[PDB]
Amino acid sequence: TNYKPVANHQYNIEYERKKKEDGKRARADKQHVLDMLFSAFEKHQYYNLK
Amino acid sequence: AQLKFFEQLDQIEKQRKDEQEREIQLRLKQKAKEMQQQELAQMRQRDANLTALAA
Amino acid sequence: TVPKLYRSVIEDVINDVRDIFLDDGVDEQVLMELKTLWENKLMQSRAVDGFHSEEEEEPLNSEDDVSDEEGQELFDTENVVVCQYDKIHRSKNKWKFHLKDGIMNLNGRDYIFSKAIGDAEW
Amino acid sequence: IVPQLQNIVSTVNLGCKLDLKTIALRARNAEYNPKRFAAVIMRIREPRTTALIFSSGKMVCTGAKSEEQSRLAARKYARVVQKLGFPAKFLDFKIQNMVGSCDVKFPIRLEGLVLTHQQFSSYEPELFPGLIYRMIKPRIVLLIFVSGKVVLTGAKVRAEIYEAFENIYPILKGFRK
Amino acid sequence: YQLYRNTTLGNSLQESLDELIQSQQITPQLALQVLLQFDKAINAALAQRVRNRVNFRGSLNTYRFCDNVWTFVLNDVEFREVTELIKVDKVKIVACD
Amino acid sequence: SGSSGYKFGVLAKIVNYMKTRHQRGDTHPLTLDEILDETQHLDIGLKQKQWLMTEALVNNPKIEVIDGKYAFKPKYNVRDKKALLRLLDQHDQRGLGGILLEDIEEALPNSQKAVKALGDQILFVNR
């Protein structure tokens, strides 16, 4: 019934994703960000925070 | 210039189809597609700029 | 097999921008001027043959000159390689290069690779 | 046996705000990737040393194998930064940690040491092969492998490493196979 | 990536365009649109025919890495591919992914 | 999605950058063409340029024109950050509802004007 696995298989899969890609990166280029930010607003008056 | 005006007029003819389409959204889809590229273009601009600076 | 790819790409690009020139506004003559201007520069350079061409805490300066010449890095004629990287990993002093889709100009000749693997010590 | 120093981690304040992106583009041998880490990693060949230069002006230098070599390497890193043109100062070159390695030259029984010294020594075979003898009077963490190589870590000054070796020398000789 | 514009191919193109711009034969903005088309085309063209590859060996010098791009300057080394030897006293290597 | 010219955010950006360079002490009336010039964004396209000038700066409910040149409309008083007693001094509206949100960033954080403001009559309650 009980095996001897070292790293759970599910845990090992998330590790590669988080290491490969970081969801939030540099806190930098304020001017650059605004443009990215303004553009989204054109499509919609309302977007959820996430 | 009047031929160009006629071409512009065709524009309004097909914008009628656009309304009927919405009444039935292609323009909206195109706009959405255009919105998506902006971010990729900026990313290319930063990395591309860095490459230009390098050489 | 390289002049061929270039012709191939020039043709495709020219064909693919025709409508843009037209939509933007431009006579097809301008398009042909582009092709001519473009083909001609390569012929003038003569790097290869083309079908078109044939037609104390402060006195820090007390420790200086450690840096070498920055200007040595740029010649403007230096063999320039354009490629993409998959992973570049160096362990200790070993640098390993895992590259792809590259166009090389070595000793004057032009080469291409889908993958390139290299090693170097720094 | 005399232990030999293998790593000096030193921290020095340049004194002013630094723009990291500008440093990466002009300095040679420099990598600054924001997603993985927030600092410029700069490496020099003449004295082997890898230095993280932080954005707020604090610099940490690593990889030097002696005290004078670390101070000299930190000064070299500061001067490269200055030649770019940012205002530069050198303050508090203070060593943080020094790792030293030595060999007793005789086989040692780790299991026995745990039996008579359970209070200061912790050993688990599965997690790591070597016993850790954290020592309180001279604050140092010493890792002893079965073969006999002892690595001493966490010493503020050169001396501390030498006194911990004197104490460990005879205790190991008692547990020598 | 506007990466491949300063290449033989890309520069001959820009020069040709500038002329047309100079003679008002061809103009700007449109020129930008053409370059944009070029970027898409050269990226796509590169990953096409393939069937080529090169192992190289070297002794480094400078290195640089920014947001996504390595630029080296390997020197005094010879690279042999398919029994062909290339001798370089100074080589600059740029990879932008 | 109605009518869109060039890149989105040109308006909410032109006004702001002005809402910024002027506060940064660069105080002087300007025009949309001058803003494109200084921002090196002149190549926004004549159509968009025109649409911005005629409409974007017409649909703005608080934009100020004497004539040629657009002016800031958020505060009637120049953001001096000092000597408001006359406004403060006036006793016909119990201090005229002073706004903290308008205050700050003219050339200093209010925590500097206020202390003198604390030193002087100026009294502020963060209710």
Q: What is the enclosing helix (H) or strand (E) of D85?
A: none
* Cβ pair C50, C3 in contact under 8 A: yes
Distance from the Cα of F54 to chain B's closest Cα (Å) equals 22
C97 forms beta bridges with C88, C118
Q: Is D103 helix (H, G, I), strand (E, B) or coil?
A: strand
Tell me the nearest-neighbour CA distance from B30 into chain A, angstroms.
12
Q: Does C115 touch chain E (CB under 8 A)?
A: yes
Q: Indicate the resolution in Å.
A: 3.9
**Phi/psi of residue C54, nearest 5 degrees:** -60, -40
**B45-E74-B54 Cα angle (round to 5):** 20
Q: Residue F115 in 3-state DSSP?
A: helix
Q: Where are the alpha helices (DSSP H) in chain D?
A: 20-26, 67-84, 110-116, 158-175
B and F: touch, per 3+ CB pairs < 8 A? Answer: yes
Closest approach of D161 to chain C, Cα-based (Å): 26
Residue E30 to residue C18: CA distance in whole angstroms: 11
Sequence spans of domains, chain D: 1-9+96-177, 10-95
Helix (H) or strand (E) holding D3: none
C-alpha to C-alpha distance for C83 and E91, rounded to whole angstroms: 14
- Mark whether A and F touch (3+ CB pairs within 8 Å): yes
Token pair in block for residue A18: 């988080």
Chain B: list its partners (3+ Cβ pairs within 8 Å).
A, D, E, F
- Residue the block writes with tokens 């166009």: C103
Instruction: With CB atoms and an 8 Å threshold, state whether F7 touches B38.
Output: yes
* Elucidation method: cryo-EM
* The amino acid at B7: E
Domain D1-9+96-177 maps to which CATH number in 3.40.50.1100, 3.30.310.10, 3.40.50.620, 3.40.50.2000?
Answer: 3.30.310.10
Phi–psi pair at A49, nearest 5 degrees: -60, -45
Tell me which residue of D77, D88, D13, D6 sits closest to D46, measured CA to CA: D77
Of C37, C72, C118, the CB nearest to E15: C37
Distance CA C35, CA D102 (A): 72
CA distances from C38 to D156, E38, F67 (A): 67, 13, 50
Residues followed by a break in chain C (C to N exceeding 2.5 Å) are: 55
Is CATH 3.60.20.10 the right assignment for the domain spanning D10-95?
no
B31 close to F (CB below 8 A): yes
D134 annotated as a binding-site residue: yes
Where does E52-97 sit in CATH, by number? 2.30.18.10
F77: left (phi over 0), alpha (psi -120 to 50) or beta: beta
Residue F54 DSSP one-character state: I
How many Cα atoms sit within 13 Å of E35 on the Cβ side?
A: 21
> In sequence order, what DSSP letters do the residues of C56-75 get, joined into one string?
--S-GGGS---S--GGGG--
CATH number at residue C5: 1.10.287.100
Task: Answer for the pair D89, D15: CB distance below 8 angstroms, yes or no.
Answer: yes
* Rounded alpha-carbon distances, angstroms, from residue D90 to A5, C16, D16, D44, D76: 52, 59, 10, 19, 11
Query: CA E46, E49, E51, E53: dihedral to nearest 10 degrees?
Result: -20
DSSP H or E run through B17: helix B2-23
CB burial of A22-44 (b: ≥16 within 10 Å; e: otherwise) equals eeeeeeeeeeeeebeebbeebee
Token pair in block for residue E41 = 């085309």
Domain that holds residue C37: 1-43
- Residue among C57, C58, C61, C66 with most chain D CBs within 10 A, to mutate: C66
Phi and psi based region of residue F6 (left: phi greater than 0; alpha: psi -120 to 50; beta: remaining) = left
Q: For tokens 């009927």, what's the residue?
A: B20
3-state secondary structure of D95: strand
Task: Determine the straight-line distance between the first and last CA of chain A, rounded to whole angstroms.
Answer: 42
* D45 contacts in chain E (CB < 8 Å): none
Determine whether domain E1-51 maps to CATH 1.20.1430.10: no
From F75, E74, D156, select the one nearest C90 (Cα to Cα). Answer: E74
D139 secondary structure, DSSP code: T
Contact C23, C36 (CB under 8 A): no
Domain boundaries, chain E: 1-51, 52-97
Contacts of residue F5 in chain B, CB cutoff 8 Å? Answer: none
Q: Show the beta-strand stretches assigned E in chain F.
A: 64-65, 70-71
Burial class of residue C61 (count of CB atoms within 10 Å of its CB; 0-12, 13-18, 19+): exposed
- Judging contacts by C-beta atoms under 8 Å, the chain B residues touching residue D20 are none
Strand bridging mode D40-44 / D49-53: antiparallel
Residue C2: which of C120, C112, C116 has the closest Cα?
Answer: C112
